Subunit: 237 residues, 4 copies
């Protein structure tokens, strides 16, 4: 099974797996049961932004979700990445729907990672930025239902021709190249990621959420990981 570190934008409260009773942002380290969460005032059908930061100086993973002219939602947690992830990973975005549903559209996505070795400026870096997705996006690995459309967006879960979202859907997009996220001779290892997202639901109740995740390089969608498992976890433990 895979090793997952994720930040979750969770739109549907599953309280029997420890979700608080409201939509929330959370930090997940090898379990869907978040290590920390914060209340998130999710807004149905408005474009929002998420920003995930990590530095190995403070060993703290932090995230903010906001919408224009709204208060932000923020969460942070101690994370020693050398203790949780292999040296090489892939990075991605995942989303699901279950019995309830929502569009999980990504409008842009950026990532940067930097690894300063032993030496005085001996830095390796990777940066990518998608402000538009093409129909053939060859630097994305799409898993499950995820697709990139002729409209320039990344739809992580299934949406019908009339634009309405489907239940029981799960899909992911991982940057194509593996990422060196830590190295034992690194003075500073750190990364950041941002994406813009549009979650819309005809339901009164949207489900299930979108997550930015970092995984083993060979990570695939766990069987039956629709609904509350967000495409990331094989079970609710």
């Amino acid at each position: 099974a895979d090793t997952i570190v994720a930040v979750e934008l969770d739109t549907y409260p599953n309280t029997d797996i420890g979700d608080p009773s409201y939509p929330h942002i959370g930090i997940d380290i090898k379990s869907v049961r978040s290590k920390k969460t914060a209340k998130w005032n999710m807004q149905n059908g408005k474009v929002g932004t998420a920003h995930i930061i990590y530095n190995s100086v403070d060993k703290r993973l932090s995230a903010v979700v906001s919408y224009p002219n709204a208060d932000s939602a923020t969460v942070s947690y101690d994370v020693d990445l050398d203790n949780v992830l292999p040296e090489w990973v892939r990075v991605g975005l995942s989303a699901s729907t279950g019995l309830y549903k929502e569009t999980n559209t990504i409008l842009s996505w950026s990532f940067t990672s930097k690894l300063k070795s032993n030496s005085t400026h001996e830095t390796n870096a990777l940066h990518f930025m998608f402000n538009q997705f093409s129909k053939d996006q060859k630097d994305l690995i799409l898993q499950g239902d995820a697709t990139t459309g002729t409209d320039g967006n990344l739809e992580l879960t299934r949406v019908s021709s009339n634009g309405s979202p489907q239940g029981s859907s799960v899909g992911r997009a991982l940057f194509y190249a593996p990422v060196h996220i830590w190295e034992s001779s690194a003075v500073v290892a750190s990364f950041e990621a941002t994406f813009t997202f549009l979650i819309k639901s005809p339901d009164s109740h949207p489900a299930d959420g979108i997550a930015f995740f970092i995984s083993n390089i060979d990570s695939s969608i766990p069987s039956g990981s629709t609904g509350r498992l967000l495409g990331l976890f094989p079970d609710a433990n």
Copy 2:
């Protein structure tokens, strides 16, 4: 008087102002008496690197100092920059010597700052990088004894023609343009800074240290701020 947030590389223990009894790295918020410190195994005449990071998600200022093939020194502290600094600042490097002395040579210096407003990618950024300093470095404001040499380095305190450092010296270099470090409509405000430094002492005992600081835009060297005040503070309170 000025408002100062600094990270100090303190080579000389002044225990009557709360220095621990060894060279140390520290975080200074409006006082020379560090809010936090860590033991620093300073190495006389070897090139070292310092890395300072801040993000407004976790509101944590962190720093690492290291030398190649040595263990690092690290410190972190809660810092709400909107509560400590004006919206606009200058950024700089400062150093001093007192009754004891040392070269305070800077071999390179980089900074980046980013301010994401209200909106989805509404980001302002500034980046500079000096990997060599010229004799006329017009984007640096030099204060006190600091100079840039024909050898490509920034000498913050006074060094004689034979290369030996002088006592009772204080000098600073601030990037020329003011920096927008926070804004009340910012989702994410953050910055990073790195410099490489060479501190050499013929003494058995080096003094006094080098600091990366952020100040009010009109900051100048406080009178008599040689020795333990590191060019940053008008008194020891």
Copy 3:
């Protein structure tokens, strides 16, 4: 006198001083009389983009101006910068109106310069990016009529309360820090600039245009440079 290198987006044909008979983009080297122009299909009231690039490998200054879903306008010219400019300069945007008028609204401005010396990676760099402008934009030097308004835009030339543009106006905006654009010991020197702009006019003929420029650091608006001289030049020579 000032020393000016500039890319002009010239909306008004001044045929008596060398302008082709149509709106055009031009590369201007120490004279309002463009070294090279291309036909520019300027679009009243639509946001356009301009992109200016230079590298010392080819020593070719090029520019492209475009609108979504229209054909681009492009111009290129030999220029040895060590030949025309001082080593240190400022960069800026300029605009004017005269008898005829237009808004000269700047919605974003990015610039990046790099200067690689003698050595194998010994590169200095400056980058700044404005995706919104505040009311007190301290890292800009505003000259003449230029203001940064409540809407988050930079208005280079005077705009009335009702957003309508005014005649005989001239304004510039310069980045605060000087920029090191060449050095005799650089293996590669190079820069790019980008800005988005909104030129709108109640008139039949808009005037007079917008330019990105590079100048001696102490450059000011020459006297009598409203209208056809675009805030850049003292006369039409």
Copy 4:
């Protein structure tokens, strides 16, 4: 067959297939027979730098190779990339030896590509930077003899235990992710690459050279491309 665009650092004169009579740098478009060359004063056993740049504004591919404190070698050529390459490519470095030999050691490699679509800032980008290479460099595709060693370097061609270079060797290294180098809807498409290199030879005549190249994504070393074909081309046409 592969489709190759490449800048060659050609240390060995193969005059019977079009080489000038001296070591040279060259711009190669779908043939080992360079479209444009310049005289290259290659220096045995000294670290050099190469810098390759392209922009779709001028559609000029240029390159400069230099050593500290020597004159630079420079070459430039018209190239419409939508004309020669597929929309998606890989990038890489290639090198070979034949009867004559040299180390083809890479100490650092940086690359940045940007593709600005239709819209006012709708830019996709990729950047990667290697200032050291590890033993398992997972984001490189190594082909032929190429290895990443214990010294932190990439050895493109076979080097013995005692650091001495071997004959009839060929190796390449490609960045793992495909790169989107052009798109019919881009206002500006552009890239730069830089690498530092150490070519050393016990021989009187070093051979055969190093190249930075761009290829179809499924490019492999053509058969029989050791020596004068630089690991890039199946024949000398």
